[PDB]
Each structure stands twice: as structure tokens, then as C-alpha cells.
């Protein structure tokens, strides 16, 4: 049975990073949902309750696993959680709820600002709604800007991190600024995580066809949108892929913004990947170096 109506939020709060009213997702920061819940008596194994998070956050961030912490009384698992569709979290009770009296439980869940839904700096109201009770927090969200010079800006973001299968994905934006750059070489290197005995990464190259103002400050690239991203991987003799996870790419004319999407493996036993993108450019030479790393959090 849906027993959402049987759950009281005794205490509910959302906090920014380091109990401030701000989150800087490109500095690996997150927000936190804290619940103290009361449950009416008479619940059973398989009964469940839901709450819903605003679409500006999720519970995974760069991770591909969609998990949520168990509700426990001591070491006893009272309910297990799942991430469902549209911001919904559902907790389903175990046999240990049966015949218990005056049950309460504490839940703490890390909330990661979603770069697809929060694409620019701004104030975001984060909400968690359980049984009509809305827990709310206005947070400042601020992103980084990449690294630039007179001729170009280089930026990038880890898109996914898949621990279970030892794979990650990453996107880099290579953007011209003023003057004319030729003979650009762009490289990607695993600074931590390279598997010398592995497979070559899958590297796709895209022309960005939109305006520069509309590039998400969050760093998000919907590369399936062929109106925004024109794949030119095939046009590009100019791409060298290595079994250690590295690539090098030559762009002859940086007359527009290029996007490199990378999908590769990393070495078993590596806690976290560190990925470096470096660009060398020639005005009509300079280097831009951009590092992407990870900050991983437990519930």
C-alpha cells in the first residue's frame, strides 16, 4: 500500500555547501536534504512512501548509479529506496516495520545540481515534497568559466562516471575568441586512471552550430541534438586514438566552436578519474590546459 499519508516530516531542511546558501558545482560541491520522519503504526513489508525532488537536483550527479541510502534503526534496515521517474524517490518497507511502535528515522541525501536543468549561474529554489509538506531552500548556483586567452577558451566537464563498469564520459568545448587560430591540436589524457592494457576510447567530434551566448555555462552538451551539434568525426585522418585512453586531434581552422565527446574505460582499482584536455593553437603558439576531476560523496 501507498502509505505516504502515514509519514510526518518532523524536521526537514535543505542546506547549501558547507552549510552556506551557495553551491559551486564545478568545484565539486553539493546540497544536502535532511529529514527526520515519523511513521504511523501498523505498516507492513512492501508498503511504500514517496517524495519528489525539484528537477534542478538529482541524487547521483556525475555517477551513473541511481541509489539512495537505506532507512535504518541502528543496524536494522527499515526500508529500501529507489529512484523513479520525474524526481520521485520511493521507499519500500521491509519485514522489520511489522508491529513496531512510534517508529522514527533520519535520512540524509546529497543533492547535486543538474547541469541539464540548471544551465547558468542563478538563484535556484530546491524543494522536496513529501505528503503535501514542502521542504524548501533558495541556493545560489555558480559555475566556472573554463580557461581562456585572446584567441580561445577551453572548457570541459565529466559527463558520466560509471563505477560498476569502469567507464566514464567527458565533453570539451573548444571556442575561438578574437583573431585567427590555425594549426590547433587538442589532446585528451587520463592523468589518473589510464589503462595501458585497455581499449581505445570512442571519440566523437562535433561542430557547434548555435550562438556562443547559448552554450550552457554549466557545460552540458546534448550531442544528440543535430541542430546544435553537427558530427564531423568522419571528416576528421586528423584523429589519433591510443589504447592508454589518450587521443590527439588536429583542427585546421578554428572558425567555430568544436566539441569533443569522449567515452572510455579507466583502470580497475582507480577511485576517481583525472582527465586533462590541452589545446595548442597558432595565431594567424599558445597552450590552454583544462583539468576535470571528481568529488564523490556518500549517503
Amino acid at each position: 500500500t501507498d502509505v505516504t499519508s502515514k509519514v510526518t516530516v518532523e524536521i526537514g531542511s535543505i542546506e547549501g555547501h558547507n552549510n552556506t546558501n551557495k553551491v559551486e558545482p564545478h568545484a565539486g560541491q553539493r546540497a544536502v536534504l535532511k529529514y527526520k520522519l515519523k511513521f504511523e503504526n501498523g505498516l507492513h513489508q512492501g508498503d511504500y512512501f514517496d517524495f519528489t525532488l525539484s528537477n534542478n537536483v538529482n541524487t547521483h550527479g556525475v555517477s551513473t548509479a541511481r541509489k539512495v541510502p537505506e532507512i535504518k534503526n541502528g543496524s536494522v534496515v527499515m526500508a529500501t529506496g529507489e529512484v523513479l521517474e520525474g524526481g520521485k524517490i520511493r521507499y519500500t518497507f521491509t519485514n522489520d516495520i511489522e508491529d513496531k511502535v512510534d517508529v522514527t528515522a533520519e535520512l540524509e541525501i546529497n543533492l547535486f545540481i543538474d547541469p541539464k536543468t540548471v544551465q547558468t549561474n542563478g538563484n535556484q529554489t530546491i524543494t522536496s515534497t513529501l505528503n503535501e509538506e514542502q521542504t524548501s531552500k533558495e541556493l545560489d548556483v555558480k559555475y566556472k568559466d573554463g580557461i581562456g586567452n585572446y584567441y580561445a577558451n577551453l572548457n570541459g566537464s565529466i559527463e558520466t562516471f560509471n563505477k560498476a563498469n569502469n567507464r566514464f564520459s567527458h565533453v570539451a568545448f573548444i571556442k575561438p575568441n578574437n583573431g585567427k587560430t590555425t594549426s590547433v591540436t587538442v589532446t585528451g589524457t587520463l592523468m589518473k586512471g589510464s589503462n595501458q592494457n585497455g581499449n581505445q576510447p570512442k571519440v566523437r567530434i562535433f561542430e557547434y552550430l548555435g550562438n556562443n551566448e547559448d552554450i550552457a555555462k554549466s557545460v552540458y552538451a546534448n550531442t544528440t541534438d543535430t541542430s546544435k551539434f553537427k558530427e564531423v568525426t568522419s571528416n576528421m585522418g586528423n584523429l589519433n586514438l591510443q589504447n592508454n585512453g589518450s587521443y590527439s586531434l588536429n583542427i585546421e581552422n578554428l572558425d567555430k566552436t568544436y566539441v569533443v565527446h569522449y567515452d572510455g574505460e579507466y583502470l580497475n582499482g582507480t577511485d576517481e578519474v583525472d582527465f586533462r584536455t590541452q589545446m595548442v593553437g597558432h595565431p594567424e603558439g599558445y597552450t590552454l590546459t583544462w583539468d576535470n576531476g571528481l568529488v564523490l560523496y556518500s549517503n
Binding site: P25, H26, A27, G28, Q29, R30, T59, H60, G61, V62, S63, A65, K67, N110, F112, K144, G146, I147, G148, N149, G156, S157, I158, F161, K163, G285, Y286, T287, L288, T289, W290, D291, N292, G293, L294, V295, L296, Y297, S298, N299
Partner: peptide, 14 residues
């Protein structure tokens, strides 16, 4: 002047 370096970190669970 000729070489600039920066970086970022993404958050996620685990």
C-alpha cells in the same frame, strides 16, 4: 602570457 591552466571538479554519488 603564453600558457594558461585551470580546472574543475564534478560532484556525484560514491
Amino acid at each position: 602570457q603564453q600558457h594558461h591552466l585551470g580546472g574543475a571538479k564534478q560532484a556525484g554519488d560514491v
